[PDB]
Amino acid sequence: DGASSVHWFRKGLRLHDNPALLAAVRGARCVRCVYILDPWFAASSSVGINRWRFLLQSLEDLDTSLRKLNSRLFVVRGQPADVFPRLFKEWGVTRLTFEYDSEPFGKERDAAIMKMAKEAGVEVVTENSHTLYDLDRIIELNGQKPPLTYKRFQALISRMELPKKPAVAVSSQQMESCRAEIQENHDDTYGVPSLEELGFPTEGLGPAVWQGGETEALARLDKHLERKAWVANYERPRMNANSLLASPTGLSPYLRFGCLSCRLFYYRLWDLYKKVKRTPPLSLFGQLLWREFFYTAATNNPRFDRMEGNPICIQIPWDRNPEALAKWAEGKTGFPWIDAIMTQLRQEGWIHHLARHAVACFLTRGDLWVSWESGVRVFDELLLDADFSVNAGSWMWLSCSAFFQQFFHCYCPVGFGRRTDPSGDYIRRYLPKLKGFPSRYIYEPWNAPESVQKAAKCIIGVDYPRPIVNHAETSRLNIERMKQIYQQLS
Ligand SMILES: O=C1NCCN1C[C@H](O)Cn1c2ccc(F)cc2c2cc(F)ccc21
């Protein structure tokens, strides 16, 4: 008997490698694809334009793909627990499918939806295609606790099966054949909203730096894996000036939103390795495996993104210092390297991993001694590839709050920028008021003589702030404070 299926998109914003959508379509007489947009989500959230644009473009891409099958995405406004009982009844739904969400809040949401579906006689299929592995199996093999160091994580997956292959494509004919009839007035209630409807400034015609959606994700995957980019990204990568700029081969926002399947990426990367080198080391997959590590650590920890009450997080007496945090968030620290990174982050929504180290170090144990929780929140607002798991996990790791086995130094907020882009042009690009400083002073403009500042038309303390801490003194004290925090545990 043919099902009437709803496939619910949350992440997994793609039709490729979508085993939950395959489950929705196989043996269905009727299929509808829904995204549930909480109309009051923004009331309690402060997420910025770049993330909203990326989401909306990802939904528009799905809707465009469905329109090729004479269908539409249904953008349903409400909260899932309110909406699904109505939808079930009004549409006569017999099956609901969705990609598994391992994050503690999503798991609790989904468990409630599954109870309500069971009560209503609705079958539920979930599939765990957001990650490479069954995170629960990793935890089970580790004595029902997540690994807290990367080598232990690697030991566990080394005695597990390999990640599932990407699921086969859903039949275009089958999905057009089983489509729900779209009503001509679909856009009264189910349309994808425009950015301007959300109060954002009018969008230009030119492309965003990071265009949302599955189509873009797959095009980028193809370029990413060209043999001509192999040496540059996998054989001999270098963190040079060009590396700081958003790359047309970058994949991390697409992986975070699910526009790109991590299993497809993993196996296409394996394929390219086998062609270039004729079994790869785990380090080939390091970007995905670190992501998987943080997902495994987060899934059973509802307080993962907080300090207090978080069983893996050392309790550190961070400073209450809202003024410093606001200067850090707005790129007004007076350290051009820090400020340029935070400006790039706000303007575009992505910054290099080593730039994340730099700014997180500066906020937390390196300089300002502000809680990593506040950095998580700013990255949640601005970073395209941030989610509950990798964002809090990375901040805890970087700040020596969790996963700690050994101390590692924070980069110098002057010297690291100097070394990464000796020309200073990264600074001139994102902080054009500093553009006239010669390269010798642009990363430390408070050290420029009065002559140089006048010729650069930028008087430090007036046109651009003085550095808000003495780094040498402050970092040495912060190191002593952290060492004591850890040594006294004994
Ligand atoms: O370089 C290494 N070594 C181990 C892992 N890793 C890569 C990091 O995960 C990169 N990264 C993030 C990725 C997504 C995100 F939302 C937040 C962060 C983030 C926060 C930080 F404070 C510092 C680094 C950060």
Curated annotation (Swiss-Prot):
Keywords: Biological rhythms, Chromophore, Cytoplasm, FAD, Flavoprotein, Isopeptide bond, Nucleotide-binding, Nucleus, Phosphoprotein, Photoreceptor protein, Receptor, Repressor, Sensory transduction, Transcription, Transcription regulation, Ubl conjugation. Changing R356A: Impairs protein folding. Abolishes binding of BMAL1, PER1 and FBXL3. Strongly reduces SKP1 binding. Transcriptional repressor which forms a core component of the circadian clock. The circadian clock, an internal time-keeping system, regulates various physiological processes through the generation of approximately 24 hour circadian rhythms in gene expression, which are translated into rhythms in metabolism and behavior. It is derived from the Latin roots 'circa' (about) and 'diem' (day) and acts as an important regulator of a wide array of physiological functions including metabolism, sleep, body temperature, blood pressure, endocrine, immune, cardiovascular, and renal function. Belongs to the DNA photolyase class-1 family. This is Cryptochrome-2. Induction: Shows no clear circadian oscillation pattern in testis, cerebellum nor liver. In skeletal muscle, under constant darkness and 12 hours light:12 hours dark conditions, levels peak between ZT6 and ZT9. It is found in: Cytoplasm; Nucleus. Residues 369-468 are annotated as: Required for inhibition of CLOCK-BMAL1-mediated transcription. The modification Phosphoserine is found at S71, S247. Changing S247D: Reduced inhibition of CLOCK-BMAL1-mediated transcriptional activity. No effect on nuclear localization nor on protein stability. Component of the circadian core oscillator, which includes the CRY proteins, CLOCK or NPAS2, BMAL1 or BMAL2, CSNK1D and/or CSNK1E, TIMELESS, and the PER proteins. Interacts with TIMELESS. Interacts directly with PER1, PER2 and PER3; interaction with PER2 inhibits its ubiquitination and vice versa. Interacts with CLOCK-BMAL1. Interacts with BMAL1. Interacts with CLOCK. Interacts with NFIL3. Interacts with FBXL3 and FBXL21. FBXL3, PER2 and the cofactor FAD compete for overlapping binding sites. FBXL3 cannot bind CRY2 that interacts already with PER2 or that contains bound FAD. Its main location: cytoplasm. There is a cross-link at K11, K107, K223, K327, K454, K483 (Glycyl lysine isopeptide (Lys-Gly) (interchain with G-Cter in ubiquitin)). Signal peptide: none annotated. One of its GO terms (molecular function) is photoreceptor activity. Its cofactor is FAD; (6R)-5,10-methylene-5,6,7,8-tetrahydrofolate. Changing R377K: Reduced interaction with NR1I2 and NR1I3. Significant decrease in interaction with NR1I2 and NR1I3. Expression in the retina is restricted to the photoreceptor layer (at protein level). Expressed in all tissues examined including heart, brain, spleen, lung, liver, skeletal muscle, kidney and testis. Weak expression in spleen. Changing K483R: Inhibits interaction with PER2. Does not suppress its nuclear localization. Inhibits its repression activity on CLOCK|NPAS2-BMAL1-driven transcription.
